Amino acid sequence: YLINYIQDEINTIFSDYIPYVFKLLKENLCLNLHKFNEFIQNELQEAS
């Protein structure tokens, strides 16, 4: 039973979870970039 179970699990994961992981990476990239902008703005204010 577990052989067929894992076969189905991998077939589902490839087509389902992988795009979600890519989306997670994209969202994290954008969020980190925006946080970088905020922190550099604060640091530049302090330096000025």
Partner 1 sequence: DFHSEYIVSASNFTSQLSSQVEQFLHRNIQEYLSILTDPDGKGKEKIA
Partner 2 sequence: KAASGTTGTYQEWKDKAQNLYQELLTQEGQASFQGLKDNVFDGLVRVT
Q: Which residues bind partner 2 (CB under 8 A)?
A: 1, 3-4, 7
- Any long-range contacts for 6-13 (C-beta under 8 Å, 24+ apart)? none
Helices (H), the chain: 2-47
* Min separation Cβ 23 and partner 1, Å: 7
Residue number with CB closer to partner 1 (6 or 18): 18
Binding mask 5-34 for partner 1 (x = CB under 8 A): ------x--xx--xx--xx-xx--xx--xx
Phi, psi of 10 (to 5 degrees): -70, -40
